[PDB]
Design goal:
part of a larger assembly, 5 chains, A alpha+beta (50), B little secondary structure (50), D mainly alpha (60), A: 50 residues, alpha+beta, two-stranded antiparallel ribbon, D: 60 residues, mainly alpha, Arc Repressor Mutant, subunit A, RNA polymerase sigma factor RpoD (chain D), DNA-directed RNA polymerase subunit beta (chain B), DNA-directed RNA polymerase subunit alpha (chain A)
Chain lengths: 50, 50, 309, 60, 50
């Protein structure tokens, strides 16, 4: 009962400041938990100054 | 000619013939899937003319 | 610049469920964790569910045992819900025996070092006659997720024990997981929040173990996140020697002589075989016939067996 | 080339009928028992796989 | 013409899959589209999914 971590990760990044990255395969359900949380931090909590 | 239910069937390994008794009938209770031999049957066709 | 959380009082209420809590939570992180944990909590966790059950006179799950009011299907169904726990073993076969008129509970099994019956009152089935007796081999293993009996047969490989009734794998400690973030005011900080994760369980897993391994897998997945035509010989040669369907005597000699594949066999010679233990003219005669039948013979030399990966 | 003709001869391959092995000996001027041997090595030569992998896949 | 007949009895167990027809007593038909993990199911505050 060992676990699953993914393999091959294409990063196709438009221009410089823009990026779209795919990461696969995950375990069923994990894309959404990893995805959402990473979204919450990135959005609502990040270090920066304006 | 008459057709035989005998368990001796051309071109099959013993693993196929496993699920069958000596007589050519699947045992009661054998769990099966598609392609499994339920009943061995052979019909006479003479002089294949290959 | 950030504050890390940690656990605090984990309050057990019933043998089933409990309420764990996580204080040191910053702004909004209660949600960022609480859902992410529910996700990993409900699904991927370790569990032990009964799998294969071989009973006494029962040929298939659709029959009826004389002397018991539960259809076999129903008894199988009751077992899927028997909650147990082991410690150092990943699969154990428990022997249940009982007789006489009355309920047969789950405590009537035979205890093992790792056997812990979390529900000794759990009903396996009733018994309707004075002398009627049921003996059963119950194979419990441990695993993750839902493995239904269907996917269980692909590998096969001599599942011949027609008496073995497979059941569906229930593997999972978790029943229901719910999280609520209530604002926790630690004596000094602007506003911080708490996490009350109220979970529900079959009694085979302790709260701290779960919530720990949950977060364990989580970061373990972030690991990756954080940084960023020429067959040569005949394919039949790599089929195992078992595919020849030899005599019991003949088959054992080859395994005993280190001959496991067809490729190994076609090399060995007639002379050598009468010298190997147990083989006489009688045994060898069987071998020569089966090989010709698949277009093979003995003693063929291959200068490159086997190739190359 | 003689192994191909002898086998095409001994069977109907791209030919009317097939020829008794005595006929073949007369056709080859080398006769009788000799020919039967060539047939064997030919079948023998197609038996041991390099040759063998393709024709075996035809049965079942 | 028939000398003998063998009837084998199979008990197939089917569970449920996208494509099956389901309906309530009210005339609402429906065909299950996706089979969802317990994780994505809408749940109430108490945490009991639907």
């Amino acid at each position: 009962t060992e676990f699953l971590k993914p393999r091959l990760v294409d990063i196709e990044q438009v221009s410089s400041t823009h990026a779209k990255v795919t990461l696969e395969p995950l375990e069923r359900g994990f894309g959404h938990t990893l995805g959402n949380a990473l979204r919450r931090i990135l959005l609502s909590s990040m270090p920066g100054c304006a | 000619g008459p057709e035989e239910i005998t368990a001796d069937i051309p071109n099959v390994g013993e693993a196929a013939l496993s699920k069958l008794d000596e007589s050519g009938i699947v045992y009661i209770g054998a769990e099966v899937t598609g392609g499994d031999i339920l009943v061995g049957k052979v019909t006479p066709k003479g002089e294949t003319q290959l | 610049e950030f504050l890390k959380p940690r656990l605090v009082d984990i309050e057990q209420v019933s043998s089933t469920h409990a309420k764990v809590t996580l204080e040191p939570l910053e702004r909004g992180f209660g949600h960022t964790l609480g859902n992410a944990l529910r996700r990993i909590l409900l699904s991927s966790m370790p569990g032990c569910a009964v799998t294969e059950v071989e009973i006494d006179g029962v040929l298939h799950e659709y029959s009826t045992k004389e002397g018991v009011q539960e259809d076999i299907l129903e008894i199988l169904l009751n077992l899927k819900g028997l909650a147990v726990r082991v410690q150092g073993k990943d699969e154990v076969i428990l022997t249940l025996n009982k007789s006489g008129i009355g309920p047969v509970t789950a405590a009537d099994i035979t205890h093992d070092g790792d056997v812990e019956i979390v529900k000794p009152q759990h009903v396996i089935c009733h018994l309707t006659d004075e002398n009627a007796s049921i003996s059963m081999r119950i194979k419990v293993q441990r695993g993750r997720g839902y493995v239904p009996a269907s996917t269980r047969i692909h590998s096969e490989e001599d599942e011949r024990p027609i008496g073995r009734l497979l059941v569906d794998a229930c593997y999972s400690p978790v029943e229901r997981i719910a999280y609520n973030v209530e604002a926790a005011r630690v004596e000094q900080r602007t506003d911080l929040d708490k996490l009350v994760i109220e979970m529900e369980t079959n009694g085979t897993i302790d709260p701290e173990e779960a919530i720990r391994r949950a977060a364990t897998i989580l970061a373990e997945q972030l690991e990756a996140f954080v940084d960023l035509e020429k067959p040569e010989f005949d394919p039949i040669l790599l089929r195992p020697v078992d595919d020849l369907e030899l005599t019991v005597r003949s088959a054992n000699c080859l395994k005993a002589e280190a001959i496991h594949y067809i490729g190994d066999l076609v090399q060995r010679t007639e002379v050598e075989l009468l010298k190997t233990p147990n083989l006489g003219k009688k045994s060898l005669t069987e071998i020569k016939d089966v090989l010709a039948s698949r277009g093979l013979s003995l003693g063929m030399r291959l200068e490159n067996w086997p190739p190359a990966s | 080339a003689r192994e191909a003709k002898v086998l095409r001869m001994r069977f109907g391959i791209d030919m009317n009928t097939d020829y008794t092995l005595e006929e073949v000996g007369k056709q080859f001027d080398v006769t009788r028992e000799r020919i039967r041997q060539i047939e064997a090595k030919a079948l023998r030569k197609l038996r041991h796989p390099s040759r063998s992998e393709v024709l075996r896949s035809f049965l079942d | 013409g028939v000398l003998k007949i063998v009837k084998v009895y199979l008990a197939v167990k089917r569970r449920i899959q996208p494509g099956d027809k389901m309906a309530g007593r009210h005339g609402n038909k429906g065909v299950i589209s996706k089979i969802n993990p317990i994780e994505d199911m809408p749940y109430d505050e108490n945490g009991t999914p639907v």
